[PDB]
A paper describes a structure:
D12_H06_D12_H06_D12 crystallized in space group C2 and was refined at 2.3 Å resolution. In the D12_H06_D12_H06_D12 crystal, both the N-terminal and the C-terminal [name] units form similar paratope-paratope interfaces with two symmetry-related molecules each. To accommodate the capping repeats packing against the central [name], the inter-domain angle in this DDD construct widens from 120° in the model to 140° in the experimental structure. The rmsd for the comparison between design and crystal structure of DDD constructs with H06, H12 and H15 ranges from 1.5 to 4.2 Å. Considering the elongated shape of the DDD molecules, which amplifies the effect of small deviations in the connector, they agree remarkably well with the designs.
In this paper, we present a strategy to fuse specific, high-affinity protein binders to obtain multivalent or multispecific scaffolds of predetermined geometry. DARPins are used as building blocks to confer the desired specificity to the construct. A series of rigid connector modules replacing the [name] capping repeats allow to combine the individual [name] domains in such a way that their distance and angle can be altered to test different geometries, bringing the binding partners of the DARPins into a defined spatial arrangement. The two helices are not just joined end-to-end, but instead the two domains are made to overlap in such a way that the joining helix is stabilized by contacts with the domain cores along its entire length.
Author numbering: 12 to 473
The structure:
């Protein structure tokens, strides 16, 4: 067609008026020459933006193919016409269309070093892994042609996507070629963020061996450990912790990994976070603790566990207010750690008289035994806390309780030179003749430790 021929050349020559006159005269907007080039092809190749937009407004096929599989987007990517690339994509151009050789627009922008075009193509979903007929990726071409900044950009985008998808072999080869293991997307997520979010234990391990920053923050302050505590990946939480992950990292909302674990019902992850130093008392902007979030979400099994851990620590530490506030929240007064120590055990050992009274006032077991038979009175007699010894005895403490070795409170008081406690125990019915499993009486122990005055008292009482 002569009209079509006139239109093709009018578009190739940048004659904006001629194009409009010819379209008004019925010229086929999608005419093709001997090799399949349409007016939109030629306008994109020659960089005539106005015509590109006119042809599209008149029904030009944005993805028209020449005989070799080139689209208008291929040609704009080749010639470096950023604005035409942007307009073509707006109108539905195939960002990943491949020619007969498997070449995509991203290959061409990387091959010829069009940085801004590479960035726009990636933003529009360009496939960084696309290989042409010869197995070349856009990165390979960038490197082959010495476009080193674009090559690193392609490595970064690839590593972020490979990490998210769990493609170990890809991740390894990307870092072998110099991929930045600590790159980030627009949100601030690093490859480690994405592997932990998606639950790829193998990738997390490989990333960390290659120097991944375990405490990378995103825009909102989220750490990889935050994400693993959110998603519930126990082993990943463990691996992150072993590699220096911060147990109490905080985000803009004030939430720590323990907040996330407790909110999303990850009991095992709460236990691991506690065992690794998680702060049960931390608070977020809304003014809530990990315990508060667990109770609201119906996880009493987690709420109680947080109360248990907090009570033992606060009882040991001597923090009376926390104890009283934890009792008001329903903390188990008789909870025990792995050794069997209750809050009362730990308050007596440390000499925290006030706390002893509170715990007893709230139903604490005055004769609770640890795994070895030590009662709270045993520990008070050991450390020499006269007031605590008297409070315990007043509350029904067993003055002659024997541990697994047959040791009684009087043995310990005599062995460690607490005369005033000896007299108190004797006054409360302590058995001066009790022998431990080695045949030792309190008298005998006082002698072995050079406590003359106590030995004299114990002898007369016999």
């Amino acid at each position: 067609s002569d009209l079509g021929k006139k239109l093709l050349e009018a578009a190739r020559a940048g004659q904006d008026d001629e194009v409009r006159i010819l379209l008004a005269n019925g010229a086929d907007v999608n005419t093709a020459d001997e090799t399949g080039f349409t007016p939109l092809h030629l306008a994109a190749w020659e960089g005539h933006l106005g015509i590109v937009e006119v042809l599209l407004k008149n029904g030009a096929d944005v993805n028209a193919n020449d005989e070799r599989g080139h689209t208008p987007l291929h040609l704009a990517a080749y010639t470096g016409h950023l604005e035409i690339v942007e307009v073509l994509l707006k109108n539905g151009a195939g960002v990943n269309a491949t020619d007969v050789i498997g070449t995509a627009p991203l290959h061409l922008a990387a091959m010829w070093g069009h940085l801004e075009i590479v960035e726009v193509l990636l933003k529009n979903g360009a496939d960084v892994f696309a290989q042409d007929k010869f197995g070349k990726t856009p990165f390979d071409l960038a490197r082959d042609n010495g476009n080193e900044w674009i090559a690193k950009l392609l490595l970064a985008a690839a590593l972020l996507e490979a990490a998210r998808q769990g493609q170990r072999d890809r991740v390894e080869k990307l870092m072998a070629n110099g991929a930045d293991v600590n790159t980030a997307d627009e949100t601030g997520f690093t490859p480690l963020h994405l592997a932990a979010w998606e639950g790829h234990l193998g990738i997390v391990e490989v990333l960390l061996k290659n120097g991944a920053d375990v405490n990378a923050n995103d825009e909102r302050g989220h750490t990889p450990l935050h994400l693993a505590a959110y998603t519930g990946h126990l082993e990943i939480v463990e691996v992150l912790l072993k590699n220096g992950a911060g147990v109490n990292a905080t985000d803009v909302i004030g939430t720590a990994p323990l907040h996330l674990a407790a909110m999303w019902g990850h009991l095992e992850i709460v236990e691991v976070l506690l065992k690794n130093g998680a702060d049960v008392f931390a608070q977020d902007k809304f003014g809530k603790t990990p315990f508060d979030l667990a109770r609201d979400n119906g996880n009493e099994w987690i709420a109680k566990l947080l109360l248990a851990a907090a009570l033992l620590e606060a009882a040991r530490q001597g923090q009376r207010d926390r104890v009283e506030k934890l009792m008001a929240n329903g903390a188990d007064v008789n909870t025990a750690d792995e050794t069997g120590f209750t809050p009362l055990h730990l308050a007596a050992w440390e000499g925290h008289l006030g706390i002893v009274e509170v715990l007893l006032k709230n139903g604490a077991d005055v004769n609770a035994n640890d795994e070895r038979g030590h009662t709270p009175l045993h520990l008070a007699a050991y450390t020499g806390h006269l007031e605590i010894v008297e409070v315990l005895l007043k509350n029904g403490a067993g003055v002659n309780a024997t541990d697994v070795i047959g040791t009684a409170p009087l043995h310990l008081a005599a062995m460690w030179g607490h005369l005033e406690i000896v007299e108190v125990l004797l006054k409360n019915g302590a058995d001066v003749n009790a022998q431990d499993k080695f045949g030792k009486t309190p008298f005998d122990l006082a002698i072995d430790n050079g406590n003359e005055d106590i030995a004299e008292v114990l002898q007369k009482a016999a």
